[PDB]
Amino acid sequence: SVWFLDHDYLENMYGMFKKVNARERIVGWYHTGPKLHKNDIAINELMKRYCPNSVLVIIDVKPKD
């Protein structure tokens, strides 16, 4: 549970992206870990704070299968 995902960083990256393209809305988050951790529940709730129907997409970059 000792983690840190920045709040303001997310907010102003979205500010920049919306300024570039306002059609893109926060709709979830991603992590490259092949398995979800016990920690991911907190990050998903944090994302839900920005999008109630937030969906997290696991993208296993390391394996190609």
Partner: protein
């Protein structure tokens, strides 16, 4: 110290409401920023459906392209003749849109003319009902007996006597859209174009607008002239009864007819309206002088005495000039005592008319 705290709380409430207004303003500004990224789309017309994914669309003022639908669209809605919004880069049909012109003089809607406005046409009104109400109210009785509905009903008679008024009255009685023909978008016999005019005649009425038709130049076609008559016969001869092109004509004179139209189905009914009756003219005076501010006693029979050989439009401008001379002599009222002299001076070469003058 309670009053000072309440004062600062009230100022705080005002500042919070100002902040909420700023919230609304900033959300509107962000919404317009989001709107800026949007890009317009060309307006086009679908000429033909090529395949399940290919369409031919011509821009309103540009060339025609073979394009494809965006994705989440109803291809049923995309029919030949629908207005759509092509993307300006990939030309894909993003969405469809609902659809002057020549029809700018076609409509001539009946208005709210009812039975009460028309006066002294009781037998004529009954004739219109007996002729027209069955095709409207009970088309199934014709199937019960087994005969095509009668199309050509001729309400021949002098113009300006209320022919279109009778038609609007019955139309309002059935609340049916009376599409009186104003030539444009409905000209058929007009020899300038042969079949495109036929297409406009058919499609503009009946199909788009439900039913109830008329015709302009009321005595022109009723009366190269021989070829014009043959083309008229071809236009009117006999059409599908699913779509109504009921030709309720009201030609101004009887001698402007030929036997080529007397056949039923072509021109079956011959509703005759004669010179308006003295009591009928009386009723027309009553209804038309209804609107004018007539203070005092009005003895309309005296003005009836010298109203012979008139029409309804004559009576209408009688009332209008009553108002005119009331303005000229500064009378909010209008009495019969000068109705007499006005009717004394409304009969000459050009029916005198406006010279009736003295009327309040």
């Amino acid at each position: 110290k309670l009053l000072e705290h309440k004062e600062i709380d009230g100022r705080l409430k005002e500042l919070r409401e100002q902040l909420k207004e700023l919230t609304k303003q900033y959300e509107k500004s962000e919404n317009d920023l989001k709107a800026l990224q949007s890009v317009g789309q060309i307006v086009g017309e679908v000429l033909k459906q090529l395949t399940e994914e290919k369409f031919i669309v011509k821009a309103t003022n540009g060339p025609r392209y073979v394009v494809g639908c965006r994705r989440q669209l109803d291809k049923s809605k995309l029919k030949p003749g629908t207005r759509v919004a092509l993307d300006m880069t990939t030309l894909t049909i993003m969405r469809y849109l609902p659809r002057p012109l020549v029809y700018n003089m076609s409509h001539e809607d009946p208005g709210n003319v009812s039975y009460s406005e028309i006066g002294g046409l009781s037998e004529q009104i009954r004739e219109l009902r007996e002729v027209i109400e069955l095709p409207l109210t009970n088309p199934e009785l014709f199937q019960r007996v087994g005969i095509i509905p009668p199309k050509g009903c001729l309400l021949y008679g002098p113009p300006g006597t209320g022919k279109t008024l009778l038609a609007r009255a019955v139309a309002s009685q059935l609340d049916c859209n009376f599409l009186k023909v104003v030539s444009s978008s409905i000209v058929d016999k007009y020899i300038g174009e042969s079949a495109r005019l036929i297409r406009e005649m058919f499609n503009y009425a009946r199909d788009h607008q439900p039913c109830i038709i008329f015709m302009d130049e009321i005595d022109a076609i009723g009366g190269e002239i021989q070829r014009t008559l043959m083309e008229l016969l071809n236009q009117m001869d006999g059409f599908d009864t699913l779509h109504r092109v009921k030709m309720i004509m009201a030609t101004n004179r009887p001698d402007t007819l030929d036997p080529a139209l007397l056949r039923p189905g072509r021109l079956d009914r011959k509703i005759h309206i004669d010179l308006p009756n003295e009591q009928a003219r009386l009723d027309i005076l009553k209804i038309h002088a209804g609107p004018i501010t007539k203070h005092g006693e009005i003895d309309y029979e005296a003005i009836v005495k010298l109203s012979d050989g008139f029409n309804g439009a004559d009576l209408r401008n009688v009332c209008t000039e009553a108002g005119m001379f009331a303005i000229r002599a500064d009378h909010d009222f209008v009495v019969q005592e000068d109705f007499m002299k006005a009717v004394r001076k409304v009969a000459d070469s050009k029916k005198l008319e406006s010279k009736l003058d003295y009327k309040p």
